[model samples]
Target: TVLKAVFLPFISKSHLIRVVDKARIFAMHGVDVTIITTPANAAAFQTSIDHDSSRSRSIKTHIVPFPQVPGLPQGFERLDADTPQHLLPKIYQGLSILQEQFQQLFREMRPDFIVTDMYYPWSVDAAAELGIPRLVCNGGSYFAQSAVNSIELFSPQAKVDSNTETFLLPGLPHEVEMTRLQLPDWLRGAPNEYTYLMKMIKDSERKSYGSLFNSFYELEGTYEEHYKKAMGTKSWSVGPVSLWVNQDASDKACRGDVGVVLTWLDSKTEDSVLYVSFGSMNKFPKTQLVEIAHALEDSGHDFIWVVGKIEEGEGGADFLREFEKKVKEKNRGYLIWGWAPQLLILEHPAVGAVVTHCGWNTVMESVNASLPLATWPLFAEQFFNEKLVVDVVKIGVPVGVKEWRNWNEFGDEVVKREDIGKAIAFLMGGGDESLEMRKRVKVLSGATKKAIQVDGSSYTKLKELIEELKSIKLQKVNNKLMEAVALEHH
Candidate 1:
């Protein structure tokens, strides 16, 4: 039988990009697949939809327009690569439309199974109604899901913007320290789509028959058994996907075009450069930006900073310009805005440390590349991620809430540029602690490399997932048959 799987991607381009690749991989393995997406992403993936008959695995991409839903603003209807957040609400609207589309397509295509990303809430209900099994593929690590789910364990919310200790993660072995400030904005009682996203995660975790994570086994071992028991389901670690992107032509070209950075490596120094980027969605205030520029300049060390287009209310383009002038005058910095080939930059020879927002994707990318992190978690589950980085993973510096460390009163704290510089310097061999940390990271990097290889644990888990998917399909058919026979008496 031709097993069919439909992948519905609901978030921004970053995670969705990885999900499409996984769908392609499953299709390559003889699972007939169709991807449901908005117009922009569909075009981005296919370029032009003239069924490519040259390859063994065939992929069909479909574009479904989302209806404007009440309560949400219009124009927030599609996922653009640059500003991918807009896709969330539109995807929320696409629920009913895509259900009909999936049902019709299922009839025509006769797929035996369905796979979806953790963006759409209707997939589980749709799968059950259609008697088809559904699997959720989170383009992040299993650790992220477990962390996001167990938000009740992150104690110390007494103060809203200072560092606090987190205790009793369901399966984790360590008491990870976190700041109330670094905690995900969702947990702080925010009223927005982020909360909705959190709810979807909660719902999807409970509803899906199984899950697929974009993580390698060795990297996220702590949560494996916990995730299995919590979801009462099987999981597949089919990742290092971004690591594989280094071989892609587009990524390679973009790497060379990231002209915003200048090389800052000494001949004898192997891993001595600090890599700064707040992932995709983090923006800094003006005061913090100036402090960062001064810190980098005064430190007199080689560094690469991936700066985004700072917003107006938060801070404007002038802040970026002022920083650029300082970097030029002192000749000690690099910059990138629209897109930085992050994976390639991580793999660069000179990059020694990462100053990051600790997004799960960045965490995945950093570890896979064997680079250490200076954890400055900005939002979402990143605070939890910072704990995993410093306390659990034992990889790099954990600089939680830079501003809160030196505050005199409530709401008066802020992260100083010197603090950032100090953390970067410390993680990049500035002292004995820094040197020891790098040694530990080097060892962890080796483990990461081994786990992503063909004979690695990740490879085995992926193969097992394929078998599991088939098994689930068979079980679902049996259940539907029994239900049919039961209804016949009435």
Candidate 2:
């Protein structure tokens, strides 16, 4: 029987893309797949799905109308980081209102199983009622997943004296340490919406059939072992999903998305340039931005920096305009004001390493590109992810951001120019540690490319999981038939 599955995504844009990619992967693997999302969100996948469905007919999207929630704008709350703080509640409210609508589709779709975003914890019970298996399309990193569990099991923060003091995250494969301030509010404090929702999600994961990770086994095998054992569930690491979906995009270096950025990169020497980006979610004040700018220039590295946009005529805006001019004139650093072709920039031969905010997907991109990183974690699971790369995996340099803060705010924490320069120096320095980091990364990079290939590790995982899904469906049908036979005799 063809495995029928429905994919549900959260409102967040990043998560939406990741989940949709997974849905496509499932469809390509010969499973019948239905992806459910709002009208605004549906377009993100329709073009890709249309082409894929034309021949395969295995994947299609089912759109649920956005709920008429008050306070949300004309756009149906497709959340980006720039989505205003005031409208968060309304967006969350809209999600809750859409629950009934979603459940209705889930029933009507007649799925044998479902793969849902972890944020939708309610789906676990929803699947139970329908007598179908549920697999959580959980968060990206196994390292961070294990770290969260370690901290939850052993409250190292409780033993520490204060927020600035570093405490060892116990029961990990490596000795990961973190400061109190490096933790988000939910992790450190009492239950609020985020915290409670996380608890429910964790509980739901424990209750579900298993979890689906967008990472691979070889890249984080130790953490994968730790996660499955500690979390007490079956999980499949069928990914580096990027390469599988794109197929040959990694090799298309001269694919003509180039701007002056690529031209500058073309002029640079091999393994000489550093790609600097704090991710789309990060917003640094003028003070922090100036520090990073001077640090890159002072360290004398050829770099391309992707900077987030500055709306509302902020102080950083004018300074960056001049700063961009200064860098262009110097021919040292290239600046991309809003978004950059991140994959292209990261994959360039001239790009030796990355200065990153350590978002897991970014981490994966850098890893797959065969490059190490200069880690500057801002919030969420990033600090723990830094430990995975810098400490555990041994392919990164920490840029000395000591506190966890909201993406849009500066919360009394900013890296100084001197320290930022030191990180850049060591990263691009070509010293023993730096060279070894690159070497290790290059080794891991090959593993990623191989894993996504046919009969490779990730491919094997997906093949086995699909078989398991098929067997489960057969067993479920057998059980139902036996029950019906008994009822008929009665």
Residue-level lDDT of model 1, residues 1-490, one tens digit each, is 4567777765455666677767766765667778877665564456322222245566788777656676545445444323445455455565545667766765665566678777666678777766767788775556666765565444345434435543344444555444454445556555466677667776775777777777766777768767776667777777666554334434433431213342443332566667788765565556666776677777777677777546554365677776777776765577675667676667777777788877777777777667778887655466666767787767767664632221111244457776777777677656777767767777766766666566677667766777877787778779889999999978
Which 10-residue window in model 2 sums to the lowest lDDT?
249-258
> Which residues of candidate 2, in runs, are more than 4 Å off?
54-57, 250-260, 480-490
lDDT of each: 0.64, 0.83
Residue 396 of candidate 2: its Cα lDDT?
90
Against the true structure, what is each candidate's TM-score?
0.80, 0.93
Model 1 whole-model lDDT (C-alpha atoms): 0.64
lDDT of 2 by residue, 1-490 (tens): 8899999988776687678878888988999999998877776556667666765668988888778776688675676656786887788799889888889998998898999999899999999999989999976699898988887889899888877788999989888888888887778866667788899999999999999998988889778888999999998887786566655443223211216678888998888998888765677788888898899889988888887745445568888888889988988888887557677777779998898889888898889999888899988789888888888889898888888887657789779999888888998887897887889999999999999788987888889889998998999889999999999998
Stretches off by above 4 angstroms in model 1 are 43-56, 66-103, 148-171, 179-182, 185-200, 244-269, 312-314, 402-413, 472-490
Estimate the lDDT of model 2.
Answer: 0.83
The TM-score of predicted model 1 comes to 0.80
